Amino acid sequence: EVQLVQSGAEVKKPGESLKISCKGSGYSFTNYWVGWVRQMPGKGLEWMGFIDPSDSYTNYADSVKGCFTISADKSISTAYLQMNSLCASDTAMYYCARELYQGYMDTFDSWGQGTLVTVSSGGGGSDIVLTQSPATLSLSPGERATLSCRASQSVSSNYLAWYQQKPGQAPRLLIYDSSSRATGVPARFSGSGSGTDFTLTISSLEPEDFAVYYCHQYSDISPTFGQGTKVEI
Amino acid sequence: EVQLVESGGGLVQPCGSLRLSCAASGFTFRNSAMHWVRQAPGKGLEWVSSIWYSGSNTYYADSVKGRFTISRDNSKNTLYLQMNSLCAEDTAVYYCARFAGGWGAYDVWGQGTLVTVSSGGGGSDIQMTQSPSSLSASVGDRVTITCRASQSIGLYLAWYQQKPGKAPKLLIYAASSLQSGVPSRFSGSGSGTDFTLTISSLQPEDFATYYCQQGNTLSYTFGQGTKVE
Amino acid sequence: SDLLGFKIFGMPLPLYAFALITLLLSHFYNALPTDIVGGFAIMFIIGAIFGEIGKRLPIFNKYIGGAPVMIFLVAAYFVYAGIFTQKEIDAISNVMDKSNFLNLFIAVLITGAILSVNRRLLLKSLLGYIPTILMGIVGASIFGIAIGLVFGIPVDRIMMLYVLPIMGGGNGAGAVPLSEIYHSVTGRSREEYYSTAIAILTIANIFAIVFAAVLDIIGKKHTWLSGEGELVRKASFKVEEDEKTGQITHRETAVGLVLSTTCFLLAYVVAKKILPSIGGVAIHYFAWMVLIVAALNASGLCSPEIKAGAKRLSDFFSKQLLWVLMVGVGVCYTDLQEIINAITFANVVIAAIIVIGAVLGAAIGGWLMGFFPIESAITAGLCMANRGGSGDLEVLSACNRMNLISYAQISSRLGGGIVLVIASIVFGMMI
Amino acid sequence: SDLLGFKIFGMPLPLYAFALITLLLSHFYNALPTDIVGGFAIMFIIGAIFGEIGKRLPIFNKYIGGAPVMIFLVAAYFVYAGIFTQKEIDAISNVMDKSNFLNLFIAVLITGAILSVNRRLLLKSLLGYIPTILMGIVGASIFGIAIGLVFGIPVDRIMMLYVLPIMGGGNGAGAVPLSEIYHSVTGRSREEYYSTAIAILTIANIFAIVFAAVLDIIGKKHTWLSGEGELVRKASFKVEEDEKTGQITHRETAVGLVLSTTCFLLAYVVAKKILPSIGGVAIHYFAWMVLIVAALNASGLCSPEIKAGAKRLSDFFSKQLLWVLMVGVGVCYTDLQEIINAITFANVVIAAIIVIGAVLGAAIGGWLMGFFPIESAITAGLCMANRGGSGDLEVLSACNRMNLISYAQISSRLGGGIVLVIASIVFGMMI
Amino acid sequence: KCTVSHEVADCSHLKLTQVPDDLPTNITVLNLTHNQLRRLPAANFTRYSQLTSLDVGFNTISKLEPELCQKLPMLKVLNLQHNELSQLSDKTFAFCTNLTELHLMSNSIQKIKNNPFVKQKNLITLDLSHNGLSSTKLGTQVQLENLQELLLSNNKIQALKSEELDIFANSSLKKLELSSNQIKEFSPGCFHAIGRLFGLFLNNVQLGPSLTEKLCLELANTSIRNLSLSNSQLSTTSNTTFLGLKWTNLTMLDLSYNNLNVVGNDSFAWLPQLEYFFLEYNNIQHLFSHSLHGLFNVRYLNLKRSFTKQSISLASLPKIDDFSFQWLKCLEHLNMEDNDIPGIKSNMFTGLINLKYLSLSNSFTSLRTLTNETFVSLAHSPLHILNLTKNKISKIESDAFSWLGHLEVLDLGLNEIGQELTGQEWRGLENIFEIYLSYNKYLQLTRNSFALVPSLQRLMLRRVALKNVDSSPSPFQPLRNLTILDLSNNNIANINDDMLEGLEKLEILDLQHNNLARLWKHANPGGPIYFLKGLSHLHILNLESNGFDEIPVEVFKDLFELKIIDLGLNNLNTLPASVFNNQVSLKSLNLQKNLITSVEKKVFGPAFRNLTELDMRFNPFDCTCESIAWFVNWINETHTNIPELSSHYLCNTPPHYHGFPVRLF
Ligand SMILES: *[C@@H]1O[C@H](CO)[C@@H](O)[C@H](O)[C@H]1NC(C)=O
Ligand SMILES: *[C@@H]1O[C@H](CO)[C@@H](O)[C@H](O)[C@H]1NC(C)=O
Ligand SMILES: *[C@@H]1O[C@H](CO)[C@@H](O)[C@H](O)[C@H]1NC(C)=O
Ligand SMILES: *[C@@H]1O[C@H](CO)[C@@H](O)[C@H](O)[C@H]1NC(C)=O
């Protein structure tokens, strides 16, 4: 008999608020508490908080107060859960339930149909996607490296850079243009290639050359780096 | 030629705010287009935002568009990145690097600060485990489900049944071992640490997942995930 | 001569000894500013000493080009042997590749050459040049496939690996785009092709230098072959139309430098954004450089004093700052390591026969159609085979013919485009 | 008409319109090679137009400084208002910092100024004339420090930011190298120093112009401390023999570059590895360059042909390539707010007191070393308190004295290096 | 086998047929249960000839050796288990004079000597169980007076004969046990041909109203005090059911589990004094006014589930006539657990005078609210303890407990209370020490919520969802002698500094399972909240499972007597230094399941000096030489108890030392 009705689904970009409304029909609603339960897909139920619509007393649980807030009003007979700043990992099926206090414990008697809020970055953007092919290298001190980097589409004017990153260190520039060498780099590092394919070949590895190398393009206004290739002993 | 981030960092609760800085020295900070580059731990580099001299063109990675804000103050030789609505994914070491254009891509790299954004693990819950977590037994069987509580929740455990694509919407047990208005043929029992739910004989409708909560604290805790039966 | 009255690069032995002591102190203390001002010092000192040495070695002075060839080989050997400290390599690289002093040099030479010609002799000169370079390519291909049959290398392998990279523009445009086209068409490995292509290219660049010196000797012996200076037969030069030029102060030289830089800027803007590629043919900006300066000359905008000033600036670069440029080219744009790692009898013989076939083809085309053979083989036969703009500068310097730098650049860039088209055809046609 | 024939930087107006169209095309399409060629391409255009504007202005050119001041002010305004697209800023910062063309320019100016002095003149001036220069320096310094304590300006600020820039060779060689020495030795920002120094420098130039006529009137009134346009007193100087210069080919001008960078290289090696601190105080390599070039001049290794060769090259840099450097300085050095804060009553009276101190110190020194004090004052202090070469002719034309132009050149040029040495010492010592 | 030498030897499941003589000579206690043996070697028993206790279980022996009992008169207790001998010689009983306890289980015995007890009549208790008998013939002559407990459970006797009880004619018994043995007839004179039987137990035996009425006559003029009977199938009672009992002075009476239905009027008037009375698990449907008349002297009356379960379909309505208790002029302890009384009539307890402890736990099927006069029937009784647990009491009207003047312990816990505590609800109370409100729905607190009862000492608010507890005047301010305060499980969010002021008597504080993480975070606006100030006497402080991750160094300034502090289940990682300095006398610490890594005396300086027990059973220790190595030294040198110090206290940070006991630095 008691009816809890929520609003329909939403899709939103991360970083913006969102209001979810839960309306109760078929009872007083001025004395029965209303709680909010979140369920990430394929996961168990998670409890968020409950509100007492008699005086809008709210009791959040486990630091939910930071990101969410719960409000309700008498006359409309509806309880609102408001996301302060939505973002990823909040894509979940949001239920509201009436809290009955049967037996001597609080029991969620009747639940709303649930709202499926799914947050999407919606990137797309046709950004140049750089994929360095050999995900790792295991080489002895004296021999070649011949790393690689492949672009989604053409990198205009051969705008490409290779960075060496020691662990726990800021990266270091090696080949600032597609072929030109940086100031302090030795002669063994040497990039090549143009268009959608590039290589960085180390003529003879050294004990201090073992690090991770990043392929970086900056032709457009959306510089995109590369996943990272690790050269190990 | 030396750049130090040395700002912000530390712990911030999600949906919070943070401000970063970079006191560049040893080169003309003005006249240099400055960039923010972040690196999530164990992952590759990823561009964040860029700005010309005099703040003329500000661009952002599509991930952080609208939540971040880059601004520079040339007179102080300092670069500000203003972060709003942080989340778990925006944790990284945040390098600020100088983009010199054709003559050197990112020639000067700062010593990035480490920003960790995460909840503190409030832990105010009573841990609850469905120990066997079996699945999909045959029709007519006698199925036993055990809900295991970290602390003594007393006779305050409720059993919830959820359809695979609907609301749970089905209180089954007011207290432990006490049917609600609707159902039948369900037998539960237990007290203290452990609890048990038993169905008399499975039916085609009763082929779905279950749940148990504790009503012993005002911070309830549903079972982490129960039988898919 | 006297041990104290002798002159090195215009400097006496005591003064140059002071400069050499400065260089040695910079080397041994490992203190060197990595920029233009600290890079030029190295380049002048080394170029001066080895140009003076190169001009006096008995067999080397005339037969193998003399001072610039000596400077080039010595610089390449020095960077190979590791004599240059890392800072010296960085400074010379900063002068040549970073700051593009090579580009400034080529731009100024092009401006000086084009702006100092009669406006009505321009198109008449150019119209016959393209068939010359094309059938020079034809002759080079003929000799390449012949020697490939001799060594049993199949004709397809010869064309894809030797004749195309040699006749191509060079490393920047002619060995990288060839690699891209090859990978796109046959789907094989790219960097594998590029590594051997650049080695064969450098080998033929060296042989182009040597053959250029030899052809200069031949032109000295046989007057009728080489019309010294202008390549055109000059049967129509009997008019010799000229106009008076007033005294030109420093300001006209700077105006010439301004014109060089701004015409390069316009060419860069055109070739990058306005008209990147006519048809399917990519166009290097130095091609537009020649077109822009030719149009400016025909436009009549520049007074004759400006043209004379540009000519004087071109002379100052071409006769004084040349040896510096040779040190730079040797250090930066010639890696002796790869040519050592890829030297063999077959490669050397194939490169020699390819270059000499190109020379023969270009000479036949030139003499057949109103050009002096030697001046139509140094340009369009050798300036095609060599490695890019650096190759053209090297070859022309070994011939002591910098009047033809405009023709050399036309040959190099337009031939690079034509060879790229020929590649896009022949890669599919053979495979 | 005048609209077709009016000259900008020695170029006819339609030709410069073509160049400006090239620059606007580059700005619109945002295509620009960020190296020497593109940097020169834009900096020549901007410098040409705005230096022609600055030169053809009635009161500006005669007093404030003309083309250099207008050029760098306008470039600074362009940066401040964000008119330059980021690529032009990168190009200018490249051709002034990474390429470091600035150091080449300053090295060329220093060597051309010092090496050009006749060896006999330098040796004679080292006897008694240079002491008058240095005593003028110290007199200006003490008067400036007194007036600074009057206004509460600290001792160090008066000594580094007012007395040294006033006693310089101007913004060309004497306000830019001072800023570089300030940045290297002290370590704080050089924008502040140059921006607040150029204003004081120009104000001092104005006051030197006025005090020229004032001193002329004083010399007319009183005679015992006056001469009739002869620096030396009761000395015949009967015959001085000067070596003739045969001819200046392009080779000797190139030798100007060799000595320019070689002296710079040796100075850098000394000041970075050999003698980093002669006492407890570090010496910047510009001071070492001044000392090295002076020693080389005294040693007489350079032939008289080479001496005039380097002078010819310096004239090309200081008169034709100065506008490019001024565009670069406006971008990379100037801070307009500091310049506006610099022009105030306190500074315009401090500069006048400093110039008065220079005048009295020069006069007392000249009387102590046998010169007529009134010409000694002008030549030693007033020629020193100018914008180098630009201000000497203006000051000596304000008076009716032209026979002292040789001593004015000695003052400006060589004191421009003496003050560099003294300023390195002072920057190290005070801070 | 061998017990620690406290004069005691214990043998169980050893299953040996030859006793170990290595037992000390002086010990005097021995059990041999779950073992089998053939013959008693007296020589081994002669070494420890003193043996007060000899116990054997699960063994079969034909007969005990009299020489053993001749060796051992000192034997006091004899226990037999699973030995089927039917007759034993009386000399064994005679020689063991000191034997005062004899045990017969699983023996099926059938015969005893007529005079086994000539001098071993001393035994207080005799038991016959798992044995089949029909007569109680033990001795043909009067003896055995000292025997006081006679057990005949698990027996097949069906009738009682007076002649069989001749031995007990002079013998006096505290209690006679005839339970679990159905007796269909009692021969007259059986309870008169017997001594003073202070007790008589007839449990799980078919008597019914008809036979018991005859038994009522049989107990006339008998010194009976302990009459208990359960499962007698006593459906109802009449006036003649306990008629003849008027000729004795009973003390207690048991009628438990007899599923009794109806008590007639004045059914107990023949019991002028009955101190104890048991009526539980009986299907009673209605109490008449005069049903309980005549109970002048009763101290304890139990009615736990003594009524018919409510059946709406049957409209059962187990109803109580008012003034039905008015004759209980001496009653002190009335119990009504698990009952289905429909509701409180205005005069249920009218007439009670000495009523001390009344429990109404789960007694009313429908008690929604307490009104002005819902307890007016109790206005004349010093009811010290009242118990209203499990009665779904929805709301409490003001002045509902005005009638309770002497009340001191009120238990409203575990109900359905949703109410704003206006304070006037407690007006009548004067001397309450403890209030239990735990496990309720919600309370809305006000500043004057407890002002009417400053006598309080214990306020238990556990899982009650306190509203408005962060009011600027603390609702606990009027309370002064409070010693125990509990706010656990309430998930309280924010707390004002004023909450605990003036509570100098507060000894025990409990705040576990509350969300107070914000109030001690450094970035909290207004600074950290120091609610623990002025607590001079706080002995036990619990803060388990609160989300804590940062303790301000000065929260425990006033904790000068803190004996036990618990901070487990939190997220503490670096508790700052000098935090336990004022804790001069600390006895127990608890930091289990935290995120602590480094143990160091810069922070645990005074804490680890003299503890009784410490607990860190699960933590992410970084077992490097920098931090843990000091603690390992303290582990191996300190006598403070560290439970599960090995298996549980583990380290993981050092990947090489991950999963390694902290004992192994
Ligand atoms: C009882 O015997 C044990 C075993 O020898 C002995 O340790 C103990 O002291 C004795 N008891 C007395 C009171 O001597
Ligand atoms: C009690 O029962 C007896 C039965 O003999 C009866 O005579 C007597 O009147 C009864 N007393 C009452 C009902 O008060
Ligand atoms: C109570 O009954 C017993 C048993 O006969 C008797 O001895 C005693 O005197 C009675 N009490 C009173 C006060 O008569
Ligand atoms: C009943 O409650 C009302 C409510 O205030 C009160 O006025 C009245 O005095 C109460 N009566 C009794 C008898 O307690």
**CATH architecture for the domain at E507-665:** Alpha-Beta Horseshoe (3.80)
CB < 8 Å from B in window 55-94 of A: 59, 61-63, 66-67, 84-85, 87-89
Q: Which two tokens stand for residue E591?
A: 């930091």
Write the residue in E418, E439, E493 that is nearest to A60 by C-beta: E493
Whether residue B89 sits in one domain with residue B70:
yes
Give the distance, in angstroms, between the CA of residue D66 and the centroid of all CA atoms in the same chain.
14
The region, left, alpha or beta by phi > 0 then psi within -120 to 50, assigned to residue A46 is beta
Q: Which two tokens stand for residue E393?
A: 């009491």
Q: Which residues contact C327 (CB under 8 A, 6 or more apart)?
A: C42, C43, C46, C47, C71, C75, C92
Domains delineated in chain A: 3-119 (2.60.40.10), 136-232 (2.60.40.10)
Q: Bridge partners of E230? A: E203
Whether residue B24 sits in one domain with residue B113:
yes
Task: Please say whether the beta carbons of A130 and A215 come within 8 A.
Answer: yes
Task: Please say whether the beta carbons of A29 and A43 come within 8 A.
Answer: no
Return the residue whose CA atom lies nearest to atom 8 of ligand 1.
Answer: E5
Q: How far apart are CA D422 and CA D204, in angstroms?
A: 19
Amino acid letter, D31? A
Whether residue B110 sits in one domain with residue B132:
no
Phi, psi of B209 (to 5 degrees): -85, 155
The structure tokens 């590791």 sit at C82
* Known binding residues of D for Na(+): 166, 168, 384, 386
Amino acid letter, E321? D
C141 marked among binding-site residues:
no
* Nearest-CA distance B210 → chain E (Å): 25
Whether residue B68 sits in one domain with residue B28:
yes
Task: Please say whether the beta carbons of E59 and E81 come within 8 A.
Answer: yes
Please choose, from the candidates E8, E2, E58, E6, the residue with its C-alpha nearest in 3D space to the C-alpha of residue E29.
Answer: E8
Please choose, from the candidates C77, C107, C26, the residue with its C-alpha nearest in 3D space to the C-alpha of residue C334.
Answer: C77
Q: How far apart are CA C224 and CA C406, in angstroms?
A: 23
- DSSP summary character for residue E91: H
What residue spans define the domains of chain C? Answer: 7-99, 107-230+257-430
Residue B207 domain boundaries: 128-214
Return the residue whose CA atom lies nearest to atom 11 of ligand 1.
Answer: E26
Structural element, H or E, at residue C74: helix C67-81
Give the distance, in angstroms, between the CA of residue C419 and the centroid of all CA atoms in the same chain.
17
Burial D84-115 (b: 16+ CB within 10 A, else e): bbbbbbbbbbbbbbbbbbbbbbbbbbbbbbbb
Task: Please say whether the beta carbons of E440 and E413 come within 8 A.
Answer: yes
What own/partner pairs with CB < 8 Å and gap ≥ 24 does A149-153 have? A149/A197, A149/A198, A149/A199, A149/A200, A149/A215, A149/A226, A150/A196, A150/A197, A150/A198, A151/A195, A151/A196, A151/A197, A151/A198, A151/A217, A152/A127, A152/A128, A152/A196, A153/A128, A153/A196
- Would the CB atoms of C180 and A181 count as touching at under 8 Å? no
**CATH number, domain at B193?**
2.60.40.10
Q: How far apart are CA E322 and CA E314, in angstroms?
A: 23
Residue to test with chain A: of B1, B4, B15, B125, most A Cβ within 10 A: B15
Can you give the length of chain E in residues? Answer: 665
Task: Please say whether the beta carbons of B188 and B198 come within 8 A.
Answer: yes
Q: How far apart are CA C252 and CA C116, in angstroms?
A: 14
Task: Please say whether the beta carbons of E536 and E512 come within 8 A.
Answer: no
Q: How far apart are CA E324 and CA B36, in angstroms?
A: 87
> Would B224 be classed as within a structural domain?
no
Burial grade of D135 (CB within 10 A; 0-12, 13-18, 19 or more): buried
Residue of C nearest to A177 (CA): C98
Please choose, from the candidates B17, B20, B16, the residue with its C-alpha nearest in 3D space to the C-alpha of residue B4.
Answer: B20
For β-strands E252-254 and E226-230, DSSP reports them as: parallel
Task: Please say whether the beta carbons of C179 and C194 come within 8 A.
Answer: yes
For β-strands A108-111 and A160-165, DSSP reports them as: unpaired
Phi, psi of B144 (to 5 degrees): -115, 125
- What three-state secondary structure class fits E621? strand
Amino acid letter, E161? K
Q: How far apart are CA D199 and CA D344, in angstroms?
A: 10
Q: How far apart are CA C334 and CA C200, in angstroms?
A: 12
Can you give the length of chain D in residues? Answer: 431
Write the residue in D25, D258, D316 that is nearest to C11 by C-beta: D258
Q: Which two tokens stand for residue D109?
A: 């100016």
Phi, psi of E639 (to 5 degrees): -90, 0
Amino acid letter, D176? V
Q: How far apart are CA D274 and CA D269, in angstroms?
A: 7
- What three-state secondary structure class fits C114? helix
Q: Any chain C CB within 8 A of the CB of A152? A: no
Which ligand is the nearest neighbour of the Cα of E266? 2
Residue of C nearest to D321 (CA): C254
Burial D224-251 (b: 16+ CB within 10 A, else e): eebbebebbeeeeeeeeeeeeeeebebb
Q: How far apart are CA D240 and CA D121, in angstroms?
A: 10
> How far does chain A reach from its first CA to its final CA, in angstroms?
70
Distances in Å between the alpha carbon of D1 and those of D4, D13, D117?
A: 6, 11, 45
Task: Please say whether the beta carbons of E232 and E211 come within 8 A.
Answer: no
> How far does chain C reach from its first CA to its final CA, in angstroms?
64
Task: Please say whether the beta carbons of C112 and C311 come within 8 A.
Answer: yes
CB atoms within 10 A of CB C218: 14
Q: How far apart are CA C174 and CA E284, in angstroms?
A: 111
CB pairs below 8 Å between A and C: how many? 32
Can you give the length of chain B in residues? Answer: 229
Task: Please say whether the beta carbons of E156 and E132 come within 8 A.
Answer: yes
- Would the CB atoms of B218 and E569 count as touching at under 8 Å? no
Domain stops at, among B92, B117, B142: B117
Which ligand is the nearest neighbour of the Cα of E48? 1
Structural element, H or E, at residue D132: helix D129-151
| Radius of gyration for the alpha carbons in chain A, expressed in angstroms and rounded | 28
Q: Resolution of this entry in Å?
A: 3.1
Whether residue B202 sits in one domain with residue B112:
no
Q: How far apart are CA C4 and CA C13, in angstroms?
A: 6
In chain B, residues with a C-beta closer than 8 Å to the C-beta of A15 are 66-67, 84-85
In chain A, residues with a C-beta closer than 8 Å to the C-beta of C190 are 193, 197, 199
> Would B229 be classed as within a structural domain?
no
Amino acid letter, C333? Y
Task: Please say whether the beta carbons of D225 and D216 come within 8 A.
Answer: no
- What three-state secondary structure class fits D146? helix
Q: What is the full DSSP assignment across C223-266?
A: TTT--SS--B--TTTTS----------HHHHHHHHHHHHHHHHH
Task: Please say whether the beta carbons of E70 and E95 come within 8 A.
Answer: yes
**Which amino acids bring their CB within 6 angstroms of ligand 1?**
E 5, 24, 26
Task: Please say whether the beta carbons of E353 and E326 come within 8 A.
Answer: no
Ligand 2 midpoint to CA E246 (Å): 15
C285-299 vs C101-114: helix crossing angle, rounded to 10: 30
Please choose, from the candidates C418, C73, C330, the residue with its C-alpha nearest in 3D space to the C-alpha of residue C213.
Answer: C73
Method: cryo-EM
Q: How far apart are CA A78 and CA A76, in angstroms?
A: 6
Amino acid letter, E132? G
Please choose, from the candidates B72, B2, B75, the residue with its C-alpha nearest in 3D space to the C-alpha of residue B34.
Answer: B72
Amino acid letter, B71? S
Ligand 2 pocket: which of E239, E263, E270, E293 to mutate (most atoms <8 Å of CB)? E239
Q: Which two tokens stand for residue D44?
A: 């020549």
Domain stops at, among B117, B138, B172: B117
Burial C156-165 (b: 16+ CB within 10 A, else e): eebbbbbbbb
Domain stops at, among B98, B117, B136: B117
Q: How far apart are CA E110 and CA C379, in angstroms?
A: 140
> Would B123 be classed as within a structural domain?
no
Structural element, H or E, at residue D421: helix D405-430
Which ligand is the nearest neighbour of the Cα of E239? 2
Q: Which two tokens stand for residue D277?
A: 């601190």
Q: Positive or negative, the Cα torsion across E451, E453, E456, E462?
A: negative
Distances in Å between the alpha carbon of D428 and those of A194, D274, D283, E108?
A: 51, 18, 8, 119
Please choose, from the candidates C141, C171, C181, the residue with its C-alpha nearest in 3D space to the C-alpha of residue C424.
Answer: C181
> Would B99 be classed as within a structural domain?
yes
For β-strands A172-175 and A160-165, DSSP reports them as: antiparallel
Whether residue B137 sits in one domain with residue B113:
no
If one counts the domains in chain B, the total is 2
Please choose, from the candidates B71, B91, B79, the residue with its C-alpha nearest in 3D space to the C-alpha of residue B13.
Answer: B91
Q: Which residues contact D407 (CB under 8 A, 6 or more apart)?
A: D129, D231, D379, D383
Q: How far apart are CA E328 and CA E300, in angstroms?
A: 10
> Would B226 be classed as within a structural domain?
no
* Nearest-CA distance B14 → chain A (Å): 7
CB < 8 Å from B in window 61-80 of D: 79
Task: Please say whether the beta carbons of E331 and E358 come within 8 A.
Answer: no
Structural element, H or E, at residue C22: helix C13-29
Ligand 3 midpoint to CA E248 (Å): 7
Whether residue B137 sits in one domain with residue B110:
no
Burial grade of E93 (CB within 10 A; 0-12, 13-18, 19 or more): buried
- Would the CB atoms of B66 and A47 count as touching at under 8 Å? no
Distances in Å between the alpha carbon of E638 and those of C319, E548, E604, E608, E613?
A: 92, 29, 14, 9, 11
Give the distance, in angstroms, between the CA of residue C316 and the centroid of all CA atoms in the same chain.
18
